[PDB]
Structure formats: C-alpha cells, structure tokens
C-alpha cells in the first residue's frame, strides 16, 4: 500500500533516556524518573484528547464524505471513457512499432547461440 | 489489466487517527470518537448517494452504450484492414534486413566458444 | 499473434462505480442503481445493433473478399520470386564476410580459457 | 526457414466483430449477422477464384520453371568456383592473423586465474 | 527502524585502557586502577542524576505530549486528503505513460530469446 | 561447412498460393489449379533439362578437373613453406611478448581473491 | 562495533628480532638476549605504571562521567524531537516521488521477460 | 594444429547441381548427367596427375629436406640462447613490478567481501 | 595482521646456487662448496651476534617501554572522547541523508521484478 | 614451460598433397609418387646430417657450457642480494599504502549487503 | 614465494635439436651426436666449477652474513616503531571516514532488494 502512514517514532522512557552497562546511578531513582515522565505525558495528552477530539472527528468525517462521493461518482466514469480512447489509440500504435523493431532484436539475439565449455571438478 | 482502477485509500478511524503503544488517553473516549466519525461519514454519504445516484447511472449507461457500439462496429474492421496492409509490408521488409544482419551476428557469436576452467571444493 | 485485437475495457457496474469497505450507503439503493445502469446500457445498445448491424457486415464481407483474393493470388508469388533473388545474393555475400570475420572472433574467444578457482562451504 | 510466408491475419466473424461479457444485444441477431458476413465473403471469393485462378497458376508455373533452371544450372557451379578461390585466400590469411593475435589473448586470459571464496548457508 | 538511537560507545576500564600479552605491570596495581576509575565514574554520575534528572523528565514529557497531540490530530488527516488527490492524479498519469513505453521494452526483450550451449564435465 | 549451398526456397503449390481457415472457394477447383501448376512446371523444366544438361556438365567437369589439379599440386606445398617461415617467426615473437605481458595480468588477477558471503533459504 | 580500538602491534622478542632457518648464531646467546629484552621492557614499564597510573584514571573517570551525563540527558531528547519532524516531512515527500518514479521503472522491468534457452550436458 | 590445411570444398554431382523436392525432370537423365560429369572429371584429372606428378614430388622433397635441415640445426640453438637471456631479464623485471602492483590489487579485492542475501522458493 | 613482518628470502646453498638436471660437475665438489658456504656464513654471523646483540636489545626494550606507556595511557582515552563526539554527530547526520536517499533507491529496485524464462535440458 | 619449442609443421605426403573423396587419379600412381617424395627427402636429409652434424653439436655444447656456468655462478647471487633490498623496501611501502586504501574499499563493500528475492519453479 | 628463482631452460640434446616423425637420418649418428654434445658440455662445465667455485662461495657467504645481520638487528625494530605510529594514525583516520561513507553505501544497497522471477524446465 502506497498511502499507508509510516510507523511512529519510539518514545518510551527507556527508548529516549537510554543507557548502557557502563552508565549507572542509584537504583531507586530510575523508577521515580520513569513514573514522573510517564504520568506527566499521559495526564497532559488525555485532557487535550478529551477536550478537543470530537469536533475534529466530526469535521473530517463530513469532509471525507463529500470527497469520496465526488471521487466515486464523477471521476471514475470519466477515467473509463479516457481509457476507451487510450485502447483505440493503442490498436493503431503498437503493431506498427513492432513491425520495424522486432526483426532487429530477433537478429541481435543470435549473439548468444554459440556457447561451449569444458570443466573439471575436485572435492574432498 | 492496464485499464483497472487502482485500490482506494484506507480511511477507517484507526487507519487515519493512528496511535502507538506510547500514546494514550482515557479508554472510553476512543469509542465515542470512533462512533462520531463513522456515523457522520455514513449519514452524509448515504443521503447524497440516494438523492443523486440514479441520474448519473442513467447518463453514463447511455453514453457507454453509444461509445461501445461505435468502437465495435466501426473501428475494429478498419484496424483489421490496416493489419492486412501491415502484413503485406512485413513480407518484403523482414527477409531483406535479415540477409544483411544475420551473418554478422552469427560471426560475433564465436566469442563464447572457448570456455574452460578447473575448480576444487571443500565442505565440513 | 501480432494482429489480434487486445482485450476490452471492463465496464461492469461494480467495475466502474467501485467502492471499498469504508464507503457505504443504504443497502437497497445499490440494486436500484445497478439495474438502472445495466438496463439502460442494454436497451440502448440492442436497438442500434438490430437496426444497423447487417449492412456493415455485408459491406465488410465483400471488401475482405476482394482484399484477400488480391493478396493470395498476386502478392505472394511476387514475394517468392523476390526471395529467389535474395537467396542468390546471399550465396555470394555470406561466405565472403565470414572469411574476414571468423578468424578475429575465434582469436578473441581465447580470453575465457584460463579460469581457475577454489571454494569452501559451510552449513548448519 | 527464412523464405516462408508468415501466417495470415485472423478475420473470422467473432475475431473481427468482437465483444466482451459487458456488451450484448438480442441473441437471435448474432446468428443473422454471422451468416450474412460469412456467406457474402464466401460467395464473393469463390466466383473470383473460379474465374481467374487457372491463368495465374499457368503463368507462374512457367515462370518458376525458367527461374529454377537458370539457378540450378548456371549460378551454383559459378558459386562453387568462387568458393574454391575463397578457400585458397583463407589458407594464406588465417594463420598470419592468428600469429600476431593469439599471444595477446592468451596473456589476457590470466585475469581469471585467481578466484577464491568462502560461503556459509542456512535453511529451515 | 530509522529513528532508533545507535548503540553507545564502550567505555569500561578494560575497553579504554587496553593492553596486550606483551604489555604488563605489577599485578596488584590493575585492581587499584580499575577500582579508582569505576568508583570515580559512578560517584560523579549518580549525584548529577539524582539532582537534575526529574526536572528534565517532566519538561520533556509535557513537550512530547503537546507534539504528539498535534501530529496525531492535525497532520495525518491532511496527509490523507493529499493522498486522495495523489491517487486521482495517478489514475490519469500511469496508463498514458505505459501506452508509449511498454511496446518498446517488450520489443527489446527479444534479445534474450536465442540462448544455446553445450557442456561437458569431469570429476574425480 | 562454410562452402555448402544453402537450402532452396519452398515453392510447392500449397506453399506459394497459401490460404487459412477463413479463406475458401469451391472444393473441386483446388485440385484443378494444383494439377495445372504442377504439370506446367514439370513439363517446362524437363525439356530444358533434357536439351541442355549434358553440355554444361561436361564443361564444368573439365573446368573443375583443371582447377583441382592446380590447387592440389602447386598451391599447398607453397603454403607449407610459408607455414615453416611463420613458425620460425613465432619462436622469436611469442616469448618476448609474454615476458612483458604476463606479470601485469597475473597481478591484476588478485582482484577476485577476496570473495565472502552469507545466505539463508526457505521453501514450502 | 565502529568505536572499538584496533588490536595492538605484536612486539614479542621472536616477533621483532625474527630469523629463518638459514640464519643462526650460538644457541645459548638467544636466551640471554631474550631475557635482557623482556626484563628491561617489564622493569621500565612497571615503574611508570605504578607511579602515574592512578591520577590519569581519576581524571578520565570524572571527565567521562560529565560527558555521559550531558549526552544522555540533553542530546537524545533533542534528537527525538528532530526525528518527529523528519517523519512529518517524509509523510509528504515519499508518496509524491513514488508517483512519478514507479511507472517508469515498472515499464523498464519488461526487458527481462523474454528469456529462453536450450542446453545439453555430458559427463564421464 | 595451426598449420593444418583446411578441408576441401565439396564438389560431387549432387552437391553442386542440387535440387529440392519441388524440382524434377525425367528420371533417366539424372544418371546420364552424373556419369558424364564424373567420368569427364576423372579422365581429365588422371592424365595430368600421371604426366606431371613425379617431378613436383621430387622437387619439393629436395626443397623440404634443405629447409628442415636449416631449421633443426641452425635456428633452434640460437633461439635457446635467446631464451637464456630472456630468463635472465625476467629475474630482474618481474619482482620489481609485483612489488608496486600487488598491494593495490589486494586492497581493491576487499570490494567483494560483504555479500549477504535472503531467498525463498516454491515449486509444484 | 597488518603489522607483521613478511617472511625472509630463502638463501640456502641449493636455493641460491641452483642447477637443473642438465647442469652437472664432479659429484664430490658439491659437498665441498656447500660446506665452505655454510660454515663461512655461520662463523661470520655468530661472532657479530655475540658481540653486538645485547646492547641493541637493551636499547630497544627501553624505547618500546616508553612508547607503549605513552600509547596506552594518553592516546586511547583521547580517542574515546573523540568517538563520543563522532557518535553525537552521526545521530543527526544519518537519518537526514536516508530520508532523501531511500525512496529513490527503493524505486529503482523495481527494475528486477519482471524476470521470466523457459528452459529445456538434455543429457547422455 | 615458456621456453619450449613449439611443435613442428606436418609435412608427410598425405598431409601436404591432400585430396578429398571427389578427387582421384589412377590408383597405382599414388604409391609411386609417395615413394619418390619420401625417398628423395630422406636421402637428401641423411647425407647432410651425417656430414655436418658433429661440428655443430660440439660448438653448441661448448658454448652452452660457458653460458650456464656464467648464469649459475655470477647472476643468481646478485639477484638474491637485489631481492634482499626489495624486501626491505616492501616492509616500509606496503603497510603505509594499505592504511589509506583499506577503509575506502571496506566501505564500498557495503553495496552488496542488501540482496533479497523470491522465486517459483515448475517442471514436467 | 615472491623471491624464488624461476626454473631453468631445458637444454638437453633431444630438447634443443628436436625432430618430428617426418624428419630422420641414419639411426647410428643420433647416438654419436648426443654423446659428443653431452660429453663436451660436461667436460667444459666441470673444470670451471672445480677451478672457480670455492672462492665465489666464500665471498658470497661472508657478504650475506653481513647483510642479514644488518637487516635483522637494525631494520626490523625501526619498522616496528614506524608501525606503532601508523596504528596511532589509523585510530583517528578510519572512523571519521566511515562516518560519512557508510550511510551512502547502505542506501545504495537497496537497489538489489526487489528481485522476483518465474521459471519452467523440461528434460528428456
């Protein structure tokens, strides 16, 4: 699928404040920092979602409805008529080109008709 | 098939307002937002379809009827006559070109007639 | 076959007014729209076919008869005489070219006569 | 065979007035149109064949007789003498060219005499 | 994943003050040096972490909350509309280009339709 | 064989006045036309052969006798002496060229001595 | 690992004062020379290590502590924000480029769709 | 063998006055023509051979005797001395060139040391 | 290993005063010459080794001690800090380049997605 | 072997006065001509060999003795000293070049580390 | 081995005065000529070897002793110090180059990630 949104960027605590085996502090502070980060993030995202989510959903639902009706019932039939004319053109175009092109490429194919070889193998 | 309409763009709620394991709000708001979006979309598309669909179908059915009659009963026989003349031309064109081209390419094919080699293999 | 007419453009109702899982109206309107489209198309194509088909068939049958007689009984024997002369020319042309060309390409073939190699493989 | 006439162009009724599953008229008219086309074609070709075929056959038989006698009994022996002289020239031409060419191409063949490699494979 | 932080740089004592079999001092000094290095590193990192970690976590949690809300609920729907228009353009663009391009590349494909060869193998 | 005459051009009745399944006349006229063509061809070729064949055969037999005696007993020994001198020249030419050429091409062969790879396969 | 220190230079006695089977002195002098070299090297390296090692270890431990704190807690979050913006740009960039590029490369792929060949093998 | 005379040109009756299945005269004339040709050729070649063969054989035997003595006992030892000097030159030439060339080509060989791949297969 | 001394030059008596099967003197002189050469070589190398070896060993042991201390305890930590900065730069550099480069190369990969072929084999 | 004399030129009676199946004289004359040729050749070569062979052998034996002594006992030791100096130069030359060259070619090797493919096969 | 003397030039009697099956003299003279050649060669080489061999052996033994002492005990340690500095330079050089080069070559590797194909085989 070409029109699929690519995956998000990992942002978890251990994926953004990342340490190796050589880097350490006190053990108990890790949980405190992680809890602070996670709860701040959640508490600030949730209120915005609750306050502003419905209106955007309504607006974009209505907009997509109109867009999809237009596409399905005015664009596709026109494209089909266009395709009819394209086929009519191809009927005249393709054979005429093949006439002049095919003999040359059939002739050039004779370069690969003389292969011969000998081989010997060993193993242990 | 060349003249086939390509697949649509995914637009479902979870495919347009997409989140990862790091992004969350309150659980119950998800269903509310999804229901609002889906029902708005359906209720706005259905009325337009009901009101305006039949006339477009009638018009394009009539148009396609005329187009297809023209194509089937005036274009294809003409193309067949054209093809007859094309074959007549090929009869004279192809052998004359092959005469001058084939000897050269048969001669050049001799470059691949001297392959020899030796090999040894091991495994464990 | 070079002179074969390419396949038609799909034009069925579900192949021109095409929808996905995300796009829906009322269920019953689909059958109404499909019936309107199909019956309009058929009723408009059938009358034209009935009224105008025979004359075109007669005319093109007569035309093709004349064309094919001309091709079979005046063009092909002439092409055969032409081919006789072409063979006579080739008898003199091909050996003379091969004389000067073959030694060079036989000599160049010696580039591929010194292949050697060693290998070892593993698997699990 | 180089001097063989290429196959004809398909011209049958269903191969020139061609329809798909989407294109239809009344059922009975198809047989009427096909019969009209086929019988017109046959009735117009047969009379011309009967009236004019024998004279063309006689003329071209006589012409081909003369042509083939000329080719068999005056051209081929001359070509054979020409070939004798060609062989005499090759005797002097080929070894002299091979003298100067072969050492270089034998030397260049040493580029492919140092292949070595290692591999490992897995499967499941 | 494109947006993943690359692994750290190894900095352990034996990985930064590295010696070979040819380089040696007294045995007991190795432990003294290693202990000094490790404990200095830990004692200086831990205090900074304890003193300054929470505020940075809070700030970046709040910042990421705002950023992610913006991305999820204002950018993606706009991109989806953009994709709708892109599909509409492709419907007209692709077949027209394929019409003129495909015959040429189908014709050029005939260069690989004349392969022949002979081989002989030996083993021991 | 380089000096072999290439095969004739097919000229039989059904190979020069050729028809397909779509092209037909009355059945009985086919045999009449074929008989006329074949018998005219044979009756015109046979008399010419009978009247003029022996003299050409005698003349070309005598001519070829003289030509072959000249070739066998004056050209080939001279070519053998020429070959002796050619070998004498090669003795001095080839080693001197190989001296300067071989080291370079042995050196360039080292480009293919570092191949390594890993693979994994699946099947069902 | 990109940031790993490469292996040392071999410096052992037999690896720096190296002889072959053709080069020999008295047997007993080899041990004397080896002992002198090894003990001088060890006695001069050990005192320097003992005298100067601890201070360098302390200094670099403190320095690395500060550096790693800076990297972990000020650089990585900024890079993550940068990555968010990069993803937003890619959403608009990639599909638009693929629209114009893919048809051409799909068309060019038709060059490899006409392969045919025949082979014969022998063994002993 | 480089100095071997290439095969003669076929000149038999059926190989120079050649006909196909489409070309025929009276049956009995074929044997008459063949006998005339063959006996004329033989009767004219045999007398010349008998009259003039011995003197040419004597002359060329004497000439080849002198030529071969010269080659065997004056040219080959001189070529051997020349070869001695050539070897002396190679001793100095080859190692010096390999010194400057080999490192570069060993270095360039590293381009083929990073191959990896995955595959899947199906059959029926 | 890059910093390993390459093998010596063979200098044994039979490897420097080398003869073939065609070159011979009296048998007993070979042993005399070999003994003279070998004993002169050994007697002249041994005294120099005994007289001058220890001082060079002492000097180079001391020198290498100082060099290795400098390398291990002043260069490597600095290189590690440099590597830290290099990683910090890469974090910003690599994703930005991949953004603009990957779509193009993914698109160009479509040239190899249309392979088809047919084959036939024989053996005996 | 580079300094080996290439094989002689075939000069036997049937290999220099060569005939095919189409060329014949009286049977008995063949033996007469062959005997004359062979005996003349032998009788003229043998006397020259007997009269002049010993002196050339003596002269060239003496000459080769002097040449080979010079080569074995004055050229080869000098070449060995030259080789010693060459090795000394290589010790300094090769690592320095590899330093600057290897990283680039290791980097360029990454072009072949992304191979993937799918296949399907059929047989009968 | 690079510094190995290449094999001698064959000089035996039958390898320098070489004849084929077509070239012959009296049988008994062959042994006389061979004996003369061989004994002259041996008798002239042996006296020179006996008279002049020892002094050259002594001189070159002494010379090689001095040369090898110099190489082993003054050149190799210096080269080792040089190698230490070379490694120090590489530590800084290689990662910096890999930083800018690797992303580009990883990106270009995506050209080989789209292979697909179909095949059919036959045998008899």
From TrEMBL, chains A, B, C, D, E, F, G, H, I, J, K:
GO terms for molecular function: molecular adaptor activity. GO terms for biological process: caveola assembly. Keywords: Cell membrane, Golgi apparatus, Membrane, Transmembrane, Transmembrane helix. The keyword DNA damage does not apply. The keyword Cell membrane applies. It is a peripheral membrane protein. One of its GO terms (cellular component) is caveola. Its main location: membrane. The chain crosses the membrane at residues 42-75. It is found in: Cell membrane; Golgi apparatus membrane; Membrane, Caveola. Belongs to the caveolin family. May act as a scaffolding protein within caveolar membranes. Interacts directly with G-protein alpha subunits and can functionally regulate their activity. This is Caveolin. It comes from Strongylocentrotus purpuratus. The chain holds residues 29 to 152 of 159 of the full protein.
